[PDB]
Amino acid sequence: AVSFIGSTENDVGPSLGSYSRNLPFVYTRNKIGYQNANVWHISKGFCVGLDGKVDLPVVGSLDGQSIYGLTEEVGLLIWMGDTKYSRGTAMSGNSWENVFSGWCVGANTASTQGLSVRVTPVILKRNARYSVQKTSIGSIRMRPYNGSSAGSVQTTVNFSLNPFTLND
Ligand SMILES: CO[C@@H]1O[C@H](CO)[C@@H](O)[C@H](O)[C@H]1NC(C)=O
């Protein structure tokens, strides 16, 4: 079986966080991110993976992944995937992308499916500080497989980037 145990709306990074450091200039570890190991409760042979989607406009790329725009001065590199940050999938484009191939819980056991979102600020153009307001990032949806079904359970959660400031 499967049930939604997370939050529909999720903020990425601490509110009003401040970060210090040619163009494009990339900054922040997992500081600006959201992580939750328990978003869906799964059991009895349920198989599930994750799809991720970024709604921000694409304004450039770096080493194979999109640079998403926030302001004409600030951009973002984004990763979505399974719970642990190191397993994040670098995001490109604005379509739903497979960000976690998935796994199946035991035939007679219960566990959970989590996720993580991480971003790193990028200075596209310069002015001394750069501020960013609360902005919608995108979403992540569970992807059942092997015949498993989501039934009427909530499959998608959304993410918003909390406001932050970048200091040169
Ligand atoms: C079995 O552990 C579970 O594996 C899944 C797939 O890697 C993770 O999404 C999930 O968060 C994790 N749950 C916990 C409590 O750690």
Q: Termini separation (Å)?
A: 50 Å
CATH architecture: Sandwich
Number of discrete domains? 1
Number of helices: 0
The helix-and-strand class reads mainly beta
In total, how many beta strands? 16
Task: Estimate percent helicity.
Answer: under 10%
Protein name: F17a-G fimbrial adhesin
Binding site for a carbohydrate: 37-38, 82-83, 111-114
Subcellular location: Fimbrium
Family: Belongs to the fimbrial protein family.
Model description:
This protein is mostly beta strands and 168 residues long. It has strands spanning 2-4, 9-12, 17-20, 25-26, 33-43, 47-54, 58-62, 65-69, 74-81, 88-90, 97-104, 110-123, 129-132, 135-144, 156-161, 164-167. It has one domain: Immunoglobulin-like, CATH 2.60.40. The termini are far apart. Belongs to the fimbrial protein family.
Keywords:
168 residues, mainly beta, Immunoglobulin-like, 8-stranded antiparallel sheet, 5-stranded mixed sheet, 59% strand, binds methyl 2-acetamido-2-deoxy-beta-D-glucopyranoside, F17a-G fimbrial adhesin
Ordered list of secondary-structure elements with their pairings:
Blueprint: E1 2-4, E2 9-12, E3 17-20, E4 25-26, E5 33-43, E6 47-54, E7 58-62, E8 65-69, E9 74-81, E10 88-90, E11 97-104, E12 110-123, E13 129-132, E14 135-144, E15 156-161, E16 164-167
Parallel strand pairs: 2-15, 3-16
Antiparallel strand pairs: 1-5, 4-12, 5-12, 6-11, 6-14, 7-8, 8-9, 9-10, 9-12, 13-16, 14-15
Residues 37-38, 82-83, 103, 111-114 line the site of methyl 2-acetamido-2-deoxy-beta-D-glucopyranoside.
